[PDB]
């Protein structure tokens, strides 16, 4: 199977640098042009740079010329982006991206978010959104977790370690005035289950190495 796995992103000070790595397998990497493409939050895709299969020719968007360098290690089936003198305009998800002539739909990596900010990493506070008479009709109650005041993106939320899947809605994070993010994750479940079944949201904020499990307790009269 085709896999392209980026690493090396995250939070970085303005004026600082990051080294992005991308490990590729499942197709003949060393025979293709490769590229980096980025996407600033809420914006479109923007081509950043590309490189010939043997590394001997490469191109860059003018906004990064002289401070970003694309390179590859064909022996290690890997692609790199060395990024210097970073600015807020560089904040984006960075994707390694195969030349489209490869003709494979799954030819880009998962992406790594780069956040150019002077702020510290900060883990979320996780609060229950408790099921009550105000979130329950028919045989279904809504409950959730409020994942509040973290930085930077992203967080992941699961329910019951991934066993609970249907009826889940994890909302896009919103940036508060404070400069911290907040998000809710909710789920609708059977009302009958509420006495018997435990509902636990599993929150992971890798940037701060914060993991929280919060059990969400019902309200009854």
């Amino acid at each position: 199977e085709v896999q392209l796995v980026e690493s090396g992103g995250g939070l970085v000070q303005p004026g600082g640098s990051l080294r992005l790595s991308c490990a590729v397998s499942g197709f003949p990497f060393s025979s293709y042009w490769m590229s980096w493409v980025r996407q600033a939050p809420g914006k479109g895709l923007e081509w950043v740079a590309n490189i010939k299969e043997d590394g001997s020719e490469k191109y860059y968007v003018d906004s990064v010329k002289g401070r970003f360098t694309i390179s590859r290690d064909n022996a290690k089936n890997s692609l790199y982006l060395q990024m210097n003198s970073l600015r807020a305009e560089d904040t984006a998800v960075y994707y390694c991206a195969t030349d489209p002539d490869v003709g494979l739909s799954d030819s880009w990596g998962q992406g790594t978010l780069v956040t150019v900010s002077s702020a510290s990493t900060k883990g979320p506070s996780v609060f229950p959104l408790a099921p009550s008479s105000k979130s329950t009709s028919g045989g279904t109650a809504a409950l959730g977790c409020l994942v509040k005041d973290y930085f930077p993106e992203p967080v992941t939320v699961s329910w019951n370690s991934g066993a609970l899947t249907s009826g889940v809605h994890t909302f896009p994070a919103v940036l508060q005035s404070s400069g911290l993010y907040s998000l809710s994750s909710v789920v609708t479940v059977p009302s009958s289950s509420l006495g018997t079944q435990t509902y636990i949201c599993n929150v992971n904020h890798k940037p701060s190495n914060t993991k929280v499990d919060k059990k969400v307790e019902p309200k009854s009269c």
Binding site: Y59, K134, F171, P172, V186
Partner: protein, 215 residues
């Protein structure tokens, strides 16, 4: 640089409809090295068409591409509910390998009113000086909805934020969260917390409310 302009910016069509996405180049694209990508919200783009008219691996027959020179199209011959995305064209004949600005395709469905739920602040959160009050609008269509917060009957401005999920891949609905943020102090100044929802699917607006401190 070759500049790619996509049209329309936004497109809303039902399952079974034919969708057409246009990509115009400021100069001719040699070798028809013109690609199309599908991007779902918050996910990696997938390559759908390369060389103007070739389907990528795993791409179903309902997706096709055509064109040459300065005019290209991506067609979805028969829409399926899982086909909502932003679609981007890209030229890769000569660097910079620029992208168009994208067409956002929404899948249209019949009107669906939201179910409305309200969640007071947790005692945990209250310990720490802030109160978040959450209103959930679940499984509705179209996306446009108005949420108005009222505390002891006065409507709020500037202290709430909303977020919307991507469309459901089977039933094409949205959900929306609206969070009202008050200082724990200011929370205590008032009693009735209400979320009032206006939506095309509701015959009249719906209010969901609680009194500060109840079951």
């Amino acid at each position: 640089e070759i500049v790619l302009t996509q049209s329309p910016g936004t497109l809303s069509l039902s399952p079974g409809d034919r969708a057409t996405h246009s990509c115009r180049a400021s100069q001719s694209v040699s070798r028809s090295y013109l690609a199309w990508y599908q991007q779902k919200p918050g996910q990696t783009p997938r390559l759908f068409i390369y060389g103007a008219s070739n389907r990528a691996t795993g791409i179903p027959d309902r997706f096709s591409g055509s064109g040459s020179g300065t005019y290209f199209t991506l067609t979805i011959s028969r829409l399926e509910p899982e086909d909502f995305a932003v679609y981007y064209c890209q030229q890769y004949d000569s660097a910079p390998d620029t992208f168009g600005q994208g067409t956002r395709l929404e899948i249209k469905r019949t009107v669906a009113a939201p179910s409305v739920f309200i969640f007071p602040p947790s005692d945990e959160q209250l310990k720490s000086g802030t109160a978040s009050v959450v209103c959930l609008l679940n499984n509705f269509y179209p996306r446009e909805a108005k949420v108005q917060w009222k505390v002891d009957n006065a409507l709020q401005s500037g202290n709430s934020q909303e977020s919307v999920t991507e469309q459901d891949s089977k039933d094409s609905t949205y959900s929306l969260s609206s969070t009202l943020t008050l200082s724990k102090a200011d929370y205590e100044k008032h009693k009735v917390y209400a979320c009032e929802v206006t939506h095309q699917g509701l015959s009249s607006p719906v209010t969901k409310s609680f009194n500060r401190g109840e079951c």
